[PDB]
Design a protein around this ligand. Structure first.
Ligand SMILES: Cc1cc2nc3c(=O)[nH]c(=O)nc-3n(C[C@H](O)[C@H](O)[C@H](O)COP(=O)(O)OP(=O)(O)OC[C@H]3O[C@@H](n4cnc5c(N)ncnc54)[C@H](O)[C@@H]3O)c2cc1C
Ligand SMILES: Cc1cc2nc3c(=O)[nH]c(=O)nc-3n(C[C@H](O)[C@H](O)[C@H](O)COP(=O)(O)OP(=O)(O)OC[C@H]3O[C@@H](n4cnc5c(N)ncnc54)[C@H](O)[C@@H]3O)c2cc1C
Lengths: 273, 273
């Protein structure tokens, strides 16, 4: 199980449905005995812009500044900016991490994107030596709770926007899973601005209801790293044996690993595969 | 053709390859007679966080602030922050827009994501009435010039990060094409951190040579809006006739419109309708 949860909110208005979803989550969790911490990015006036100021000490190569290396070094020697360190301490303590935000330009709000860039620092959050399912957060579970302006049909296979599974991929696989998180099914709330007040009410109650057994859910399916040649002189490509065993299979493995074939239905939205 | 170009750069270091790429583009375009304008976000001390601070007038409703509606009203009544107005003026004049940036967490840097959120205001950059094909920037062309830490094989169909075409979709379709932009093939320079001094110089030269005829390039293929019933009533789904006639094709129309079938090879990387 997990007794600790962190809720990262990315919305400036306390009168928003997003703020209401954050409160709903914290209420349901505390009631079931969880310890709940929050990161209201707008409320904290969080700094989302990566810079050399994220390193407190003196740099290794100040004339040729490379963020990845200088930040990793700062993480190891203990001199990352203290606002960054405070967020990293919350992350370390949490078993479950909920990201509550409105979809903005088919992605995460800039302030949340900056939170990832500044907080998910090398070694602490990820290592090329232990990628994806073997990452640092492999004992943690993450969930995206998203609100949208567009309707669900707009995001279906035949909607103008296209499949929502493709939109979710960069985030759930590229950011969350890459660091080791077991990613749970996303809570998707479409066209919230066109939803009746009573439906909005049931949406909040259905979220609280889901959170009651969230930890026991089966996570989304991502191709295991055991299928890849985790080394540079190999190009981190799928192992030869694995490649063959797949050539006779109708479907691809995931949205990103579709292998030029059909992507299993709702790979990024529903768990079962 | 187009005589005016806007280069938006998102990198904090003047010593980076990204900065080098921007300087190469500027030089190359000016040489061929282009009028070049720049938006060096970091150097412009650019604010990427959307808030009610983006509106200078009175809010139509300060009780429950809703950014989409208020910013659209501000654009119409002329109440947008001076920095947004200046960027909108740059965009309005430009024929070609180049976005130069390093890949950060499978997406654009927070500062650039924020630039889109604050600059691409409704009415100005888009209208739900004239989405994609009929968007405001339909007479403009855009291009993404991206650098990455990971190698190309890592982003191939068998690479551990998965298909790069999926990563590029949210940006090129969801942001650029949605506003009307014709999107040209992206310039992708992989593992720039493991490329010899000799090889990087040719990259710069290769980029410069491409820009000499960039305007006469065949743009990437996105399903036309004519294939969809564009109304809340219809749910914005593909026209029935299209769905049927499409059922006999092997490949879907694009990454986002894969229709549960195979994704056309390099739909977001290579042009070929
Ligand atoms: C820059 C930008 C880019 C965007 N890009 C996209 C995009 O790419 N794709 C897309 O689909 N959408 C996009 N949107 C739209 C955005 O996704 C929606 O505006 C957002 O998800 C709406 O959520 P909200 O919390 O702001 O709700 P609000 O607009 O605040 O609305 C909440 C609604 O619920 C009511 N409410 C509030 N609290 C409660 C409560 N406790 N109980 C019951 N009812 C309550 C409110 O009165 C209101 O009717 C974009 C918006 C912006 C500003
Ligand atoms: C927060 C964050 C998240 C990231 N997420 C990802 C991700 O999801 N996927 C991924 O693949 N990568 C990721 N990266 C890595 C990032 O994409 C690379 O570090 C970046 O693209 C390198 O580009 P750069 O312009 O900074 O170059 P630099 O590291 O500066 O390197 C440029 C090289 O070219 C040399 N050079 C400079 N100017 C010139 C010139 N004029 N002519 C010739 N040579 C020159 C430099 O000295 C140096 O050796 C991430 C990095 C950060 C900080």
């Amino acid at each position: 199980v997990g007794r600790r949860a962190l809720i990262v909110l990315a919305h400036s208005e306390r009168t928003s449905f997003n703020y209401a979803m954050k409160e709903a989550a914290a209420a349901a969790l505390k009631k079931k005995g969880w310890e709940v911490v929050e990161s209201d990015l707008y409320a904290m006036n969080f700094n989302p812009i990566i810079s050399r100021k994220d390193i407190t000490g003196k740099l290794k190569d100040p004339a040729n500044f490379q963020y990845p290396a200088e930040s990793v070094l700062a993480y190891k020697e203990g001199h990352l900016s203290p606002d960054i360190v405070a967020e990293q301490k919350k992350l370390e303590a949490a078993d479950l991490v909920i990201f509550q935000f409105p979809l903005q330009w088919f992605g995460v709000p800039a302030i949340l994107k900056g939170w990832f860039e500044r907080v998910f620092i090398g070694e602490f959050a990820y290592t090329y030596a232990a990628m994806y399912d073997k990452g640092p957060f492999r004992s943690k579970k993450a969930v995206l709770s998203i609100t949208t302006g567009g309707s669900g049909s707009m995001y279906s296979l035949q909607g103008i926007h296209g499949d929502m599974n493709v939109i979710l991929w960069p985030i759930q696989s590229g950011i969350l899973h890459f660091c080791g998180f077991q990613v749970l099914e996303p809570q998707l709330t479409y066209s919230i601005g066109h939803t009746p007040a009573d439906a909005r009410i049931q949406i909040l109650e259905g979220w609280k209801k889901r959170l009651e057994n969230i930890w026991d859910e089966t996570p989304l399916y991502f191709a295991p790293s055991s299928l890849f040649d985790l080394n540079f002189q190999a190009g981190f490509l799928m192992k030869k044996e694995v490649q063959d065993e797949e050539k006779n299979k109708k479907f691809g493995l995931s949205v990103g690993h579709h292998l030029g074939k059909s992507i299993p239905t709702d790979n990024q939205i529903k768990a079962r595969k």
